[PDB]
Amino acid sequence: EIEKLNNLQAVFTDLSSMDLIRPRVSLVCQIVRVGHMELKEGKKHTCGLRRPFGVAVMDITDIIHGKVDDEEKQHFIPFQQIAMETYIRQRQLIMSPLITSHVIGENEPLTSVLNKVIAAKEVNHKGQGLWVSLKLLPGDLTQVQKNFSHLVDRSTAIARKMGFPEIILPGDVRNDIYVTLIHGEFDKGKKKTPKNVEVTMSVHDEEGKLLEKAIHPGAGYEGISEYKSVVYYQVKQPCWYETVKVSIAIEEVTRCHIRFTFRHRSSQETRDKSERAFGVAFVKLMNPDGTTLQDGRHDLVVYKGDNKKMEDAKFYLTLPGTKMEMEEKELQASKNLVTFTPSKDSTKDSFQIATLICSTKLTQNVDLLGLLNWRSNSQNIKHNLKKLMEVDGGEIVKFLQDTLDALFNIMMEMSDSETYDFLVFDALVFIISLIGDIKFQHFNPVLETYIYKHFSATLAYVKLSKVLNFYVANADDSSKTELLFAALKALKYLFRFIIQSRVLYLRFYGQSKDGDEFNNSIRQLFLAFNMLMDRPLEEAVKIKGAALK
Numbered sequence: 001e002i003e004k005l006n007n008l009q010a011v012f013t014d015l016s017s018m019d020l021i022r023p024r025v026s027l028v029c030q031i032v033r034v035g036h037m038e039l040k041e042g043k044k045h046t047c048g049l050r051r052p053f054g055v056a057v058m059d060i061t062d063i064i065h066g067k068v069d070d071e072e073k074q075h076f077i078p079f080q081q082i083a084m085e086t087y088i089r090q091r092q093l094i095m096s097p098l099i100t101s102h103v104i105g106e107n108e109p110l111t112s113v114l115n116k117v118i119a120a121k122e123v124n125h126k127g128q129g130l131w132v133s134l135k136l137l138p139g140d141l142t143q144v145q146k147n148f149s150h151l152v153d154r155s156t157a158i159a160r161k162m163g164f165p166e167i168i169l170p171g172d173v174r175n176d177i178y179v180t181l182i183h184g185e186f187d188k189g190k191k192k193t194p195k196n197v198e199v200t201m202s203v204h205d206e207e208g209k210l211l212e213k214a215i216h217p218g219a220g221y222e223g224i225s226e227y228k229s230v231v232y233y234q235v236k237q238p239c240w241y242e243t244v245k246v247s248i249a250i251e252e253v254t255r256c257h258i259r260f261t262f263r264h265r266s267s268q269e270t271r272d273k274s275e276r277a278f279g280v281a282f283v284k285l286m287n288p289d290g291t292t293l294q295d296g297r298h299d300l301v302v303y304k305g306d307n308k309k310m311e312d313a314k315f316y317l318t319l320p321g322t323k324m325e326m327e328e329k330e331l332q333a334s335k336n337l338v339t340f341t342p343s344k345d346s347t348k349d350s351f352q353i354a355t356l357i358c359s360t361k362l363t364q365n366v367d368l369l370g371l372l373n374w375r376s377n378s379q380n381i382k383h384n385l386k387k388l389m390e391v392d393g394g395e396i397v398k399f400l401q402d403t404l405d406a407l408f409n410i411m412m413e414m415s416d417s418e419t420y421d422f423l424v425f426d427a428l429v430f431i432i433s434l435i436g437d438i439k440f441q442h443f444n445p446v447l448e449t450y451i452y453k454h455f456s457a458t459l460a461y462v463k464l465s466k467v468l469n470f471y472v473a474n475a476d477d478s479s480k481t482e483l484l485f486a487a488l489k490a491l492k493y494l495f496r497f498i499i500q501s502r503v504l505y506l507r508f509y510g511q512s513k514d515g516d517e518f519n520n521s522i523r524q525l526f527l528a529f530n531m532l533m534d535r536p537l538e539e540a541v542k543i544k545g546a547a548l549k
């Protein structure tokens with residue numbers, strides 16, 4: 001890219017406070033050669049094949065620390081090539097040749113050379129490297145492009161962090177799905193020469209049509225229809241560890257899946273293009289529970305058989321894709337012997353991928369979704385509520401609005417179950433406690449936005465007052481101590497919601513008929529607090545402290 005030659009300016013965004021104070025950060029530049037399979041002259045070879053060449057690494061933690069910052073410094077990061085050690089030491093072996101092995105100078109995965117460079121602080125570059133001026137610019141992409149616009153114009157490349165910052169801004173709309181090709185064990189089949197498996201991933205829809213540009217190889221480069229993995233030479237289980245970026249329409253990702261067509265890229269072009277994907281794995285970006293694909297490792301399974309069945313969405317999508325999917329179908333078949341016939345096409349071949357979904361809207365939780373489906377999952381609402389608190393606030397904050405509305409709906413529809421009242425009470429206590437945390441304190445404006453604009457209850461406040469009055473009435477309960485104490489920790493917003501429900505009652509029924517009863521509840525709550533405090537201090541020293549707080 002001649003246009004990039006003077007515009008090869010990289011900026012990594014989202015680099016949070018804990019990122020800078022990380023003990024070790026290294027600037028790893030992976031150099032992958034693209035072209036022919038074998039570095040030989042004489043035979044025509046396929047173009048566009050990626051092969052491992054080398055990786056340049058420099059520990060830029062102190063640069064990220066900001067200890068030394070200077071544009072003039074053109075850091076020459078030494079380049080480490082893979083050990084192609086088969087041409088120098090062979091010329092001197094006399095009087096005792098007894099050796100049986102093969103030639104392996106490229107077959108090492110890039111993670112191997114990466115770990116070598118990480119361990120060995122010295123790199124024998126032999127005059128090969130790259131010049132860069134590394135400086136840390138405070139702030140995210142915006143103020144970097146505004147307080148350092150000269151260095152970082154809009155034409156400067158944009159790169160984001162593997163993770164999330166300490167301050168999740170409300171409306172951090174993103175769809176950064178980072179797919180890492182950890183490894184894949186693909187059998188050599190009837191070829192003694194190990195297959196040069198290339199993961200030409202293909203985002204097909206539920207109808208099987210390939211999605212274009214949904215796969216982005218990395219920052220500073222646009223999306224592509226299909227991403228081809230590095231074609232490892234005669235490696236039975238290639239280990240790529242190649243991260244690609246997937247940014248599909250966040251509302252289309254439910255109908256979108258990735259089809260992993262594994263093609264053996266032989267030493268010759270006619271063989272390569274005459275060889276189809278002997279095996280194909282895949283994953284669908286939604287879980288069966290209506291949630292998007294969970295963040296972490298997914299153990300794909302490479303199928304075998306009719307390639308027509310491999311490429312037709314109505315079959316391979318319906319067929320299980322991951323090893324967990326093998327287990328799911330097998331276990332559902334164990335109880336029900338109704339037309340569940342396992343296929344001998346299920347070879348031992350399998351694939352491994354990791355999905356770092358950096359997104360805001362995408363849902364990954366079971367009990368939270370069941371609570372979303374409360375109107376049809378009242379049976380699990382007991383368990384959905386019993387397990388919602390272990391759901392991290394990162395998931396809750398995604399649709400806190402619908403969560404709050406659903407809790408209030410549970411309250412109005414079937415308020416008879418005081419058990420669900422208690423569950424919703426404690427879950428809401430935890431909700432407000434986590435929103436008050438520094439992580440989610442900036443959603444508190446959005447929380448109050450919901451309260452003033454989207455709160456949807458008229459008498460739940462009555463039951464909240466009743467339950468909280470019970471909480472203060474049973475303050476001496478050790479099991480209540482943590483529950484009542486955490487309620488105390490956020491009583492301001494609990495009562496903001498209660499006031500919202502009361503005022504909705506007011507403006508929906510005109511006059512406060514139970515205004516006197518309401519105030520009586522308030523007063524009896526005060527005197528219950530009095531009963532709490534006049535109890536011996538030893539039981540609840542810290543609890544009366546938080547009460548005063």
